[PDB]
Amino acid sequence: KYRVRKNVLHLTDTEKRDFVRTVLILKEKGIYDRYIAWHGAAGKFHTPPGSDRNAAHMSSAFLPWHREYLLRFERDLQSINPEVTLPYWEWETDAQMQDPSQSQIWSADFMGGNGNPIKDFIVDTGPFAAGRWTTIDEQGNPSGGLKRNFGATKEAPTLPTRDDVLNALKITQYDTPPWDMTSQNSFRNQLEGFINGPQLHNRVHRWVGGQMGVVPTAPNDPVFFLHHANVDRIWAVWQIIHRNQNYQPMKNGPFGQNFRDPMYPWNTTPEDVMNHRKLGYVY
Amino acid sequence: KYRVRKNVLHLTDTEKRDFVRTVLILKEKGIYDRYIAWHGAAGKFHTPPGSDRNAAHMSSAFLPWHREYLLRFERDLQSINPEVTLPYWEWETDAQMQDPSQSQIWSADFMGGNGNPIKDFIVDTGPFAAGRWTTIDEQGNPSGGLKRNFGATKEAPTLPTRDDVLNALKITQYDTPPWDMTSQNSFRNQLEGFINGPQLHNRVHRWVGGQMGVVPTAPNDPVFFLHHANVDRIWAVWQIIYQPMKNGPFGQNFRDPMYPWNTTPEDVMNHRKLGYVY
Ligand SMILES: [Cu+2]
Ligand SMILES: [Cu+2]
Numbered sequence: 001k002y003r004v005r006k007n008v009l010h011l012t013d014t015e016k017r018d019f020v021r022t023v024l025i026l027k028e029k030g031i032y033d034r035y036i037a038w039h040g041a042a043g044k045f046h047t048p049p050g051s052d053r054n055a056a057h058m059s060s061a062f063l064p065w066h067r068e069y070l071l072r073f074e075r076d077l078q079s080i081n082p083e084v085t086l087p088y089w090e091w092e093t094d095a096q097m098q099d100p101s102q103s104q105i106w107s108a109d110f111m112g113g114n115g116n117p118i119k120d121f122i123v124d125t126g127p128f129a130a131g132r133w134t135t136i137d138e139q140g141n142p143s144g145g146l147k148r149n150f151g152a153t154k155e156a157p158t159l160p161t162r163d164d165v166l167n168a169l170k171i172t173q174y175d176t177p178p179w180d181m182t183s184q185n186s187f188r189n190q191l192e193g194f195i196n197g198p199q200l201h202n203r204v205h206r207w208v209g210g211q212m213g214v215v216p217t218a219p220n221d222p223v224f225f226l227h228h229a230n231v232d233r234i235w236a237v238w239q240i241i242h243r244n245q246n247y248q249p250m251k252n253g254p255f256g257q258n259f260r261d262p263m264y265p266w267n268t269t270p271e272d273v274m275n276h277r278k279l280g281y282v283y
Numbered sequence: 284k285y286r287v288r289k290n291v292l293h294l295t296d297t298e299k300r301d302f303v304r305t306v307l308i309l310k311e312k313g314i315y316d317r318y319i320a321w322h323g324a325a326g327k328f329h330t331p332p333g334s335d336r337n338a339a340h341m342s343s344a345f346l347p348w349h350r351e352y353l354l355r356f357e358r359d360l361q362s363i364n365p366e367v368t369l370p371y372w373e374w375e376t377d378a379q380m381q382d383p384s385q386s387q388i389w390s391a392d393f394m395g396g397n398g399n400p401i402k403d404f405i406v407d408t409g410p411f412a413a414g415r416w417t418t419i420d421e422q423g424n425p426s427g428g429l430k431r432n433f434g435a436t437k438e439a440p441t442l443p444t445r446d447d448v449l450n451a452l453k454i455t456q457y458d459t460p461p462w463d464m465t466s467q468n469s470f471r472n473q474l475e476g477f478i479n480g481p482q483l484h485n486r487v488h489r490w491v492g493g494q495m496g497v498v499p500t501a502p503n504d505p506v507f508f509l510h511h512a513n514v515d516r517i518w519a520v521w522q523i524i525y526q527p528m529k530n531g532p533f534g535q536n537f538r539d540p541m542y543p544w545n546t547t548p549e550d551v552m553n554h555r556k557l558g559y560v561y
Contacts, residue, residue, distance in 0.1 A: 030331065030533030034542055041324035041543060044423040049316065054423075140327035140337075255313030264317055265324060265543045 003074070003085045003281040005229055008105045011087055016110045019087065020127045022080045023222055031076055033136070036219040038069065038265055040138055043216055045264040047256040052181055055264035057215065060175045060249060060257045062192050063235050064270040066228045068263060071279055073225055088229035088283065091204055095159035100207075101150045111223050115148040115210055123148050123210070128222060135211060135220040146221055147210030156198050156206030164200055169238055174248045179257055187238055191231060201231055233283045236276050247274055286357070286368045286559040288512055291388045294370055299393045303410045305360050305367045306505055310416070314359050319419060319502040321543055322352065326499055328542040330534035336463050338542040340498065343458045343527060343535045345475050347548035350515050351541060354557050356508055371512035371561065374487055378442035384433050394506050398431040398493060405430050406493070411505055418494060418503035429504055432492030439481050439489030447483055452521055462531045470521055474514065484514055516561045519554055 011019070026032045042056035042065065053059035056066065074086045094103040106113050112126020122130045123146045130145030137143040151157045171187035183189040193202035204227050205212050211220040218224045239245075247270050250259045260269050273279060294302070309315040325339035325348065336342035339349065357369045377383045389396045395409015405413045405428040413428040420426040434440040454470035466472040476485030487510050488495050494503040501507050525548050528537045537549050551557060 030539075033328070033332070034540070037324065037328045037542060040327070041320065044324070045316070045320045046423055048313065049417065049419050049423070050425045134332070136332045140329050140332065142333045262317070264320060 001277045001280070001282045003078070005074075005086045005088055005233070005281055005283050007090050008087045008110070008226060009090065009093075009103075013109065015087075018081060018084050019077075020110060020222075022077050022084050024127065025080050026076055027133070035069070035073055036136060036217070037140065039219045040140075040216040041265050042263075045256070047254040051254070053179070053254060053257065055256050057192065058181045058194070060179045060188055060247075060253065061261075061263055061270060062188060063232075064247070064273050065263050067232050067235070067273045067276065067279075068266065068268050070225060070228055070232055071273065074281070085281065086229045087226060088233050089223065089226040090230055091159045091227070092162045092165045092230075095161050100159055105223070105226070111226070112146075113148075114150045117149075121147045121149045121210060135217075138214075138216045143211075143217070143220070148212070148221070149209035151207050152209055153206055156203045158203075159207050160193075160200045160203050165234055168200065169234070169241060171238075172242065172245065174242075174245055177249070177253075179249055179253045191234060191238075201227075232276070236283060239274075239276075247271070284555045284558075284560045286361070288368050288516070288559055288561050289370050291370045291372050291393075291509060292376075292386075296392065298370075301364060301367055302360075302370060303393060303505075305363050307410065307416075308363050309359055316419065318352070318356055319500075320423065322502050323421065323423075323499045324543050328534070330532040334463070334532065336532060336535070338534055340475070341464050341477070343462050343471055343525070343531060344541050344548060345471055346514070346518050347525070347551050348541045349511050350518070350551045350554065350557075351544065351546050353508060353511055353515055354551065357559070368559065369512050370509055371516050372506060372509040373513055373516075374442045374510065375445045375448050378444050383442055388506070388509070394509070395429075396431075397433040398429075400432075403428075403430070404432045404493065418500070421497075421499045426500075426503075430493035431495065431504070434490050435492050436489055439486050441486075442490050443476075443483045443486050448517060451483060451517065452524060454521075457526045460527070460531065462527055462535055474517060474521075483517075484510075515554070519561055522552075522554075525549070525552060 043054045045055040047053045055061060070086055077084050089105055094100040101114050105111050108126050112123050112128050115121030116124050124130060128146050133146055135143040135146055168187060168190045171185060171190055173185055175188040176183045176186045181194045191200055193199035198206045205218060211217040212224060247259050255261055256264055259271050262269055326337045328338040330336045330342060353369060360367045372388055377386045380386060384397050388394050391408050395406050395411050398404035399407040411429050416429055418426045418429055451473040454468060454473050456468050458469045458471040459466045464477045472478055474483050476482040481489045494500040525537050527535060533539050534542060538547050540547055
């Protein structure tokens with residue numbers, strides 16, 4: 001409970017500077033790429049084979065899978081600069097803004113802006129604009145530049161609200177059988193956003209568009225980690241509020257989705273990361 | 284230097300029943316599938332992006348990546364039955380047989396035989412025959428049927444030889460830049476089989492055919508591990524009789540991690556320290 005992950009809106013210019021710097025270094029080093037691949041690889045690991053469920057989404061392990069993912073990313077960042085921690089994007093507040101693209105999270109000194117429709121929605125502002133930042137497709141090959149198209153779809157014209165975050169936090173069960181895209185009264189499936197979707201998480205990916213718009217390639221965009229830090233935070237909060245509640249399923253769910261099963265592509269299990277304070281950080 | 288990997292031809296009837304038994308349990312548990320995914324996932328991680336190399340093939344990390352891979356698979360086996368270790372298929376000796384498909388490895392109590400051509404070459408005998416063993420396509424989805432087609436191609440109608448092996452063993456340099464398909468005087472590249480390819484490792488895959496014919500789906504066939512065990516052996520010897528140490532593409536150096544894991548080549552340079560010998 002010593003490294004503290006802050007709200008992006010509360011970062012000092014030098015904090016934003018250092019975060020960007022380090023991710024750039026993590027990118028130059030070839031480490032960042034490992035994270036894009038792990039994500040694409042997990043999505044292709046169906047539990048069980050022939051099912052929608054994959055090691056990282058559309059099932060119970062969604063939350064702990066990405067919590068582990070962020071933990072690893074933060075440690076790698078820390079290896080570069082121990083002063084740096086993963087901030088979180090509180091999109092539910094930006095959603096209150098008239099035009100969310102006005103959020104400081106999209107300023108030229110942090111995440112960069114919306115895509116340029118003159119250049120096929122290629123983002124040309126900020127540290128990650130094309131020419132400074134390389135991207136790779138689902139196949140693992142060069143794709144040619146980050147892309148964004150903020151709220152351009154009929155399905156997700158808006159970012160998720162506070163009420164949405166507050167309504168989800170009211171769910172009494174972590175997840176419910178069958179442990180998938182259809183699970184009812186499920187805080188997990190609710191946060192993932194499949195209920196009358198896209199909501200919350202799925203809705204954020206949809207809103208941003210570009211590579212964030214497709215799960216397998218989402219990580220090419222640094223904001224991805226900031227978005228998942230927010231999701232991880234909302235889950236930490238649920239855990240605090242429901243202390244008699246715990247992870248599910250505990251057993252008899254498909255391999256890779258139970259409390260003590262390994263989470264592909266790793267050996268780490270949901271139990272291993274159930275307690276986030278134990279992981280060394282807080283919000 | 285205590286778990287001992289035996290020649291598949293030196294295995295007893297019970298040791299083979301146990302091995303098979305153990306493999307079917309892994310598949311059963313859902314653990315086996317992790318392996319097919321990891322190998323597949325690796326082929327899509329290029330070092331660097333835009334190049335011909337991937338985390339596990341066509342580059343220096345080819346050998347270290349599969350040794351680690353095999354080390355893990357074996358451990359998962361041990362977990363099920365601590366008596367079971369990973370056997371190896373000495374294909375250079377079967378290359379001498381008039382008809383290698385008669386090799387005991389292909390018996391109905393161990394790996395089953397070459398696919399039945401009338402059934403689209405789907406393996407119809409052995410423990411892993413269609414209906415007894417599920418395979419997964421490249422998309423990670425279900426494909427139904429283990430296939431094999433022994434020596435069916437023009438470029439690979441025969442298994443590598445003792446000489447081919449002996450000649451590989453002669454190579455002095457572990458690997459040479461550019462650290463890829465085109466490396467000359469490279470033990471890594473010779474054994475992988477790109478020199479005058481398809482040879483040795485590359486040749487075995489081409490020979491067996493079926494899922495083994497294509498790298499991404501290769502692990503659906505239990506022999507994959509048996510075959511790679513022999514490769515680790517051939518390398519084990521070379522090491523008795525690494526490069527690039529630095530400056531080669533990230534993911535290939537002596538101290539870089541081997542995607543999708545954190546383990547580095549160094550970590551597995553000395554196989555004995557890993558707890559096994561051949
Ligand atoms: Cu994800
Ligand atoms: Cu391979």
